[PDB]
């Protein structure tokens, strides 16, 4: 549209000012066209030159998410969308790139009474992977993530200083299964 | 032994949603200024499209970074974490905007006829606060949870040794000593307030923002006084004064150098506008990845050991 | 009198020695809040940095709004106005609200109360 | 600091194929409650 724009001259055509003037006129409303068309031009090229960057930072962009989202696991959040990650697969898309972030997303919830240690014989015990809870008649162990409860037992668990340091710790038996193999 | 200690880190996240009404401008209620306007084409509607899409970038920018939580999470009345007293951090419903009193000294530390025109943002500083309110909310009470999905919610101690343990450290060594680690970051709270009270050098970078762009329309005002060449800088007196061929000729130079006045200021607007797009696509990625759960990337939040960062709303800007 | 872009802002009378404060008149721009034309042809007319006065009406920080029936209710964005305030097209009429940043989720923190994903 | 123990170790091959190795008393938790 911008080659219809006259800018000053007597018409947008070329071929008009040559077939209507002599050259000593029609030079400087030639002159004119080339001024506005060539600021068109250099504006076009300076947004071309700008989206280009834009689209070069966008491709960066994408070449670091299939880099480590697609050909490895990820474990940086919300770089892979909404959740725990597990894979992306790309799929080709025209000008473009689309993928598919299957993710590990938590369903239901359920609460439970915590202690951040337990106490068995004046010691304290922490646990080495995960958090103790209580479903209100026992103390069981579990994982930070799921609900799976197991017994606490001596190897769930990590024997530091004494049950008057960390607050919050409750009076529990920790079952060593070493005591019924040596009564075995 | 060790020590806990905060670091403020301060981006720029949107400018200020500038936009130019092209031939009021060039031609400030002028008949023969808009036909030899419109004789020049359509520079004056892809110019007006242009900070269109610069204002829509950065609206999309705020909404792309302050945005991420769906659920507007609230802080519980109990307000005991361990001995970790967030009152500052925290905002305030006394004051009549629910901002925290850090928020306050960031806000606080930062400082027309002619078609300049200013488009308001589309978030208020209360929402963007209140959002920052569900960010600190979530990432206290459920820990890192709320950005991976349902906010599951998990004790402050439990959640300060889980992180250590995102850092190596065991847990017992939190659980032994909480309350040194509580008052030492109480303590770097109350150094990190009394150096936003201190002075704005931090704040620079957002009062630089600012002032280039106050700088760029300053400049643009200053431009409409230049001549390029012509008898006057005023329309209306070449108008006054001349024949009507012998004015539309002073008004050509008039429209060509306020022509390639607009055209440098969208330009510069343009690259200011692509390195905040840039700024704002790494402060959410910050946020995602420090606030929403524990970055294992060192000095991508700050020097040491990272465990987690707390947003504050800051005008144009972002604070960890 | 001149102002800072180097126009006259003020002016004293030549025949009365009377001086004379020149604002320029309210102007703003024309912003126009629609649906699609498949939807319907309603439209809302948004002035921009203007009050309601010198111009169905609601005022809005961004300037004078015609045509958008203001609701004390939240929605989700649809169609960004300014400040806070969004528009929507539903019974049907274009409506005005200030929008919603989502539902409040109030968290049940204690010191031994947990939530696992089961 | 602890001691020591077997479940503080992983032993693998023999102690001539790895430089700067020191000599000492590994620490068994089995035998006290085996000799109990």
Excluded at chain 2, 173 to 193: C, D, H, M, P, T
Excluded at chain 3, 85 to 108: D, F, K, P
Aim: net charge negative.
């Amino acid at each position: 549209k911008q080659l219809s724009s006259n800018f000053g001259a007597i018409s947008s055509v070329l071929n008009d000012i040559l077939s209507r003037l002599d050259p000593p006129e029609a030079e400087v409303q030639i002159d004119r066209l080339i001024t506005g068309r060539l600021q068109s031009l250099q504006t076009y090229v300076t947004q071309q030159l700008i989206r280009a960057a834009e689209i070069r930072a966008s491709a960066n962009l994408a070449a670091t998410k299939m880099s480590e989202c697609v050909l490895g696991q990820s474990k940086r959040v919300d770089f892979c969308g909404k959740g725990y990650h597990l894979m992306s697969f790309p799929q080709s898309a025209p000008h473009g790139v689309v993928f598919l972030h299957v993710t590990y997303v938590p369903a239901q919830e359920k609460n439970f009474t915590t202690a951040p240690a337990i106490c068995h014989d004046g010691k304290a015990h922490f646990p080495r992977e995960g958090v103790f809870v209580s479903n209100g008649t026992h103390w069981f162990v579990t994982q930070r993530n799921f609900y799976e409860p197991q017994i606490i037992t001596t190897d769930n668990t990590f024997v530091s200083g004494n049950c008057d340091v960390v607050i919050g710790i409750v009076n529990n038996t920790v079952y060593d299964p070493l005591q019924p193999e040596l009564d075995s | 032994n060790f020590t806990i200690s905060v670091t403020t880190e301060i981006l720029p996240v949107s400018m200020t949603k500038t936009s130019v009404d092209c031939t009021m401008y060039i031609c400030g209620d002028s008949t023969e200024c808009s036909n030899l306007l419109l004789q020049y084409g359509s520079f004056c509607t892809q110019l007006n499209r242009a900070l269109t899409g610069i204002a829509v970038e950065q609206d999309k920018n705020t909404q792309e970074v302050f945005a991420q939580v769906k659920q507007i999470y609230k802080t519980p009345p109990i307000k005991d974490f361990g001995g970790f007293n967030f009152s500052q951090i925290l905002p305030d419903p006394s004051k009549p905007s629910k901002r925290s009193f850090i928020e306050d000294l960031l806000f606080n530390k930062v400082t027309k006829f002619n078609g300049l025109t200013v488009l308001p943002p589309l978030l208020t500083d209360e929402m963007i606060a209140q959002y920052t309110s569900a960010l600190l909310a979530g990432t206290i009470t459920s820990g890192w949870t709320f950005g991976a999905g349902a906010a599951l919610q998990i004790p402050f101690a439990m959640q300060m040794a889980y992180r250590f343990n995102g850092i190596g450290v065991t847990q017992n060594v939190l659980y032994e000593n909480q309350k040194l680690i509580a008052n030492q970051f109480n303590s770097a709270i109350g150094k990190i307030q009394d150096s936003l009270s201190s002075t704005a050098s931090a704040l620079g970078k957002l009062q630089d923002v600012v002032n280039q762009n106050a700088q760029a329309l300053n400049t643009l005002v200053k431009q409409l006084s230049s001549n390029f060449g012509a008898i006057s800088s005023v329309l209306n007196d070449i108008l006054s004064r001349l024949d009507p061929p012998e004015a539309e000729v002073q008004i050509d130079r008039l429209i060509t150098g306020r022509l390639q006045s607009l055209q440098t200021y969208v330009t510069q607007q343009l690259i200011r506008a692509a390195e905040i797009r840039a700024s704002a696509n790494l402060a959410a990625t910050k946020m995602s990845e420090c606030v929403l759960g524990q970055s294992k990337r060192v000095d991508f939040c700050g020097k040491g050991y990272h465990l987690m960062s707390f947003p504050q709303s800051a005008p144009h800007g972002v604070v960890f | 009198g001149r102002d800072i872009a180097d126009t006259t802002d003020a002016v004293r009378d030549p025949q009365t020695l009377e001086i004379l404060d020149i604002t320029p008149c309210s102007f703003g721009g024309v912003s126009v809040i629609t649906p699609g034309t498949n939807t319907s042809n309603e439209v809302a007319v948004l002035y921009q940095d203007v009050n309601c006065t010198e111009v169905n009406v609601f005022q809005t920080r961004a300037g004078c709004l015609i045509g958008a029936e203001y609701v004390n209710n939240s929605y989700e964005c649809d169609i960004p106005i300014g400040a806070g305030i969004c528009a929507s097209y539903q019974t049907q009429s274009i409506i005005a609200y200030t929008m919603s940043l989502g539902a409040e989720n109030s968290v049940a923190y204690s010191n031994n109360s947990i939530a696992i994903p089961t």
